[PDB]
Amino acid sequence: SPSINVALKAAFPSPPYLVELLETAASDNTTIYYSLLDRIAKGHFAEATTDKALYEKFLEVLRDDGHMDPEALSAFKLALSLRTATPRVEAHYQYYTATVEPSLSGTQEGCDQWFLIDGEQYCSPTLDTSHGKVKGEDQLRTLPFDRKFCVGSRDVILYADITSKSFAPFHEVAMDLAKKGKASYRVRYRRSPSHSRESLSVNGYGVELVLKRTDYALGMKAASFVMQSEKPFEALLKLTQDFPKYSNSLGSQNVSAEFEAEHRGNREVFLPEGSNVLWLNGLHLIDRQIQPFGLVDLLTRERKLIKSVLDLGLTGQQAVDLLGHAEVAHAKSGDDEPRRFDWRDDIEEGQVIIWLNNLEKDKRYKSFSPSIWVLIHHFGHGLPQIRRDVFNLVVPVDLTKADDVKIVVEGLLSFVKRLIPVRFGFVPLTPTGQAIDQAKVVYYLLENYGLAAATAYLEKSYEEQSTGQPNERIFNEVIKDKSLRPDGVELSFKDIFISEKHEKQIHLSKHWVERLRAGGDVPTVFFDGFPIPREDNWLRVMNHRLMQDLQALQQAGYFGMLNESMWLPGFFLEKALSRRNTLIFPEDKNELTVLNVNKIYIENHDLMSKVPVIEASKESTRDDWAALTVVADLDDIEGQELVYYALRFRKSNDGVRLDIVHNPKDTSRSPSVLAQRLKSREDKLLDFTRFLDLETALETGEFEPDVAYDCSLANFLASSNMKAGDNFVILNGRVLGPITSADDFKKEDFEVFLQAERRTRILPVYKALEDLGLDDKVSGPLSAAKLTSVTALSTISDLPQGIFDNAPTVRTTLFKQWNSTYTSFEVGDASTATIFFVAVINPASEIGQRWVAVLKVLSELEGVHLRVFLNPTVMIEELPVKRFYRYVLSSSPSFDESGKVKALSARFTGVPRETLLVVGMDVPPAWLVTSKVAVDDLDNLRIKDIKAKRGTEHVEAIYELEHILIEGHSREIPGAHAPRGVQLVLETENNPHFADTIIMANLGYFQFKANPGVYNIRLKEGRSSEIFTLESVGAKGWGPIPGDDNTEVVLMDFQGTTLYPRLRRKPGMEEEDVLEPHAEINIFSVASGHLYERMLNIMMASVMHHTNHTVKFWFIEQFLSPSFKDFIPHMAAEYGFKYEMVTYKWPHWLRQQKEKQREIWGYKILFLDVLFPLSLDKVIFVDADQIVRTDMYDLVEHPLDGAPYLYVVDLQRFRELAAGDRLRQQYHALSADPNSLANLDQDLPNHMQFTIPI
């Protein structure tokens, strides 16, 4: 038979089978994790014979008993076949070997499950007879895979090994520990050493067999041919795998027969040619979203969202038309559009903003008429010239730094100089020390001398030097140059420290900035109310709105409502609110942190009942109803004070379902009695005249410690990601954090939150349902809070807008709009469905085959309405599908003979015999797959040749995965600029100098090479720990979040750890990290194919014999065949030189390539300086053909001076001006259009020969 046999195997060994079940079934359920850990210590699971008969017991338990529904049993089986949760188990294997062992300083007598209590080791299960001691970085770090079994005054850990039966009692020892509310418990799994080197045969991969000789109406003959073989989903794929072979059959048995000809009312109504916008229940997907491992990690949160309302009283069809609705295009189109704000200084008392423009009284604008009607009748793309104040701008300035001062000095004084009919001004910021001392001179000069002098100093300060500490002798100049016209109050001189220039103005300078929160991560600008972020580029946001203000006001003019007696600045400040609560109206207006309120109060039977609730009385209407969750620390003066103001807020509105869950600071102080102080007097709640009435009820009530209450909280706080002591106000699911004090959210802000939330989410949730037919499932605040939390997970993109490539989640209703007949059908379960893949795929596509095979496996899920379409594209001149696919994805757990863990692989029967097929690996974008188990060729897979070469038509080549990426991106504060040049050494306690990948210009790119394990990330001592400092390596989103200062990253998945750290400057120095304050000779070369390998080899032999010195080597792993890998150490000993191998990965933002040749030149010249680590300098790549007779000394010993690089790698100049990082954006501009490169490894560096030297 003619069949290549390709399997994929992970480098890391197989985890035990019982615990693979124990993590997929009990993944995130705090309850379900410790329950499946009891049936093994009972007998049920510890009874099994083989690996088949252990999974079996799980399923019937996780269905009839009360774990999971059957429309997820098959999904459990599927993830178990794909071994998805397997790397998660290797994090415990690694934490033990790299952190648990360095503390473990004793003898394992035979105490299989040695306990960890109070920094001491106890082999004995009764505790008070030790065996060892705990060292440095304590294991009591709350790692997110040893979940919280209640809480207590002392934190305890155990390392159970379930493969051994000795775990049964030792596990039960600390089961009672947390039960009686005495201590906290968590189970971290143990390395079972009795295991074999059983390889983890990974799947979720595709097998590409490209055609090198590819170049010796078809997408319509084949298109009409699937609705002719009468197998709508099974026969669609039976073309998608071997299309390059099955092209002749498209000329035999009425293959044309244009019936789907009238079915060309598809593109001219919904979507153009040559694209596949795969729909998921309402939202749009991309490539980095539609694949194997990167898709099921997204099919469960939608599942949770949907059923949330089929309990309230709806269906899966009446949920897709409810989420993909007209009113849900407000979940995103609403928060970005801001509220009006108040900036008037007359609340401070006219003492803060200082003005450059004075439009009405200016003696430079008199040329215009002072009447209002000037703007009413105005024409042109430009601005309405007038002598009256309509527009206002306020810009804060950090006087010590030169970046913000430069703006008044230039930016503002340019718009004033260029006659803009807008009033520009600013406030002298008073935050970081010195800018306060340099703000008094600004007020001294303007009140006591005039506008000239203050501005003069500012400019003349910037032009001369830029005074860090206010300069006096340059101030004497400004005095003795403009000392005339001292209006209001007269001179003081030199030492400013009086009762006004010093006092009033600086105090009220801070009063006004705090009232509208600007001083921080975002130095926020203003303009006729509405906020403006200055975290990167302010110029765009206020300028687009600038044109939109005048035509908005013109409508009021058109109607005459604008009287001649009306102040034009105080027009946009009519709605306007006092204090901008940033928690309600964020900086980044597209970022609503909402965790489904229905998902919270539903699997926590004690915590969601023992809460002092005040229902939204049935005395009032429907839209008032809302469940303001108030989770706060009532044992603190800035946590119990918000509880009483929220209570007071309920008094005013009968639409408040109040919640007062105690969030205690003190862990030994069992929460329940504090909650019982408010649950005892819950009947007559919010009937308290003063705060003192609430403060006397928290002393009277020494209740019994209900330890059952504190354990359900330990299941809620972890799920909702919450902190203790610090507070968070919630309404229908919307978190505001970190509520430092009760001043951040007074009662006069509880209404403001109800305004915006009613506006954006509350009201439209009822309107979507009113024009639908199910308006009777809005039971009180309850349903309405579940609805306003389901529709919030629709506008939350999985990927922050501006990294991978946009991914804007938009829920619309056009997916199902297309006449559904010829190329249309709905295979699978429909009305009783859970996941709704209403799809639209074209058969002529490079990855459309992969999606046909991925969605085949997702279709096999119980209750899926995978609707399928078929748009017939025509735009092709050469072969559309140049490759032979086969997707390795299985639903029912793959099981072997006596139940062993079976291998999911790929095969090609009856495949072509006279075409070379390049075996390439298309698998999630974080897999350092390398070829290691082969005998034949990568570039050469003719079937007729191997039929003789090895003796049969079969192939026994097996590829090997060895690395799971940690791809990420670095940012900066204030400006989110690129932190490039920074050197970072990712490291564990056990493995110090491990690996280092530099930050690059493309939004601070980095990607660390590692396998499942617990890591941290250092900056190497060169320049980093002097001018740059990482506050938090953002392992938890772009955010930020008050509980993620974690400079620790742990990996145990497939897609890597998407790390978004927030590196910040040390205050002071711009001074770029990219610029300065084994052997002496080395060489690298590229290779692909057994023939390419041998022509490379003779170059290595004719380069370690001609020269009298030491030469190391640096070729690239995956391209090389296993034939070559068992060859280099041989020539490295008899000749006497050194091997070593380097490799990297093209990110999801950089132009990938089709045929494996263009790929090679991408990695060769752009990926150069990052391939080799920092502990190197000179490399001498020479093409895999030449021979070096020369002494290789006058190749390293060669002056370059400005020239970075058949080349001369100088990793000192290559890091100084970052020519590799430059060639990245150089290739980005000349790869979109193939109208610039014949080749890319010798034409990209020669185009920039004058700029980037040789």
Author numbering: 28 to 243, 292 to 1152, 1197 to 1324, 1361 to 1409
Authors' text:
Central to ERQC is the ER-resident 170-kDa enzyme UDP-glucose:glycoprotein glucosyltransferase (UGGT). The enzyme selectively reglucosylates a misfolded glycoprotein on one of its N-glycans and promotes its association with the ER lectins calnexin and calreticulin, thus mediating its ER retention. The full-length Chaetomium thermophilum UGGT (CtUGGT) crystal structures revealed four DsbA-like domains (TRXL1–4) arranged in a long arc, terminating in two β sandwiches (βS1 and βS2) tightly clasping the glucosyltransferase family 24 (GT24) domain (Roversi et al., 2017). Overall, UGGT's motions can be described in simple terms as two rigid groups of domains moving with respect to one another.
To probe the functional role of the “clamping” motion uncovered in the present analysis, we engineered four double-cysteine CtUGGT mutants, CtUGGTG178C/A786C, CtUGGTG177C/A786C, CtUGGTG179C/T742C, and CtUGGTS180C/T742C, all designed to form disulfide bridges across the TRXL1 and TRXL3 domains, clamping shut the cleft between them. The presence of the engineered disulfide bridges in the remaining three mutants was confirmed by mass spectrometry. The crystal structures of CtUGGTG177C/A786C and CtUGGTS180C/T742C were determined to about 4.6-Å resolution. Both crystal structures show the TRXL3 domain tethered to the TRXL1 domain by the extra disulfide bridge. We tested the in vitro activity of the three “clamped-shut” double Cys mutants (in addition to the activity of the wild type and the already published CtUGGTD611C/G1050C) on urea-misfolded bovine thyroglobulin. As to the UGGT clamping motion, we tested two a priori rather similar double-cysteine mutants, CtUGGTS180C/T742C and CtUGGTG177C/A786C, both designed to clamp the TRXL1-TRXL3 domains shut. Surprisingly, the two mutants differ in their ability to reglucosylate urea-misfolded bovine thyroglobulin, with the former mutant more active than (and the latter mutant having similar activity to) wild-type CtUGGT. These observations point to the possibility that each misfolded glycoprotein substrate may depend to a different degree on a different subset of UGGT inter-domain conformational degrees of freedom. The three motions are to some extent independent of each other. These observations open the way to the cloning, expression, and purification of Cys quadruple mutants such as CtUGGTG177C/A786C, D611C/G1050C: these mutants would block the molecule in a clamped and bent closed conformation across the cleft and the central saddle, respectively.
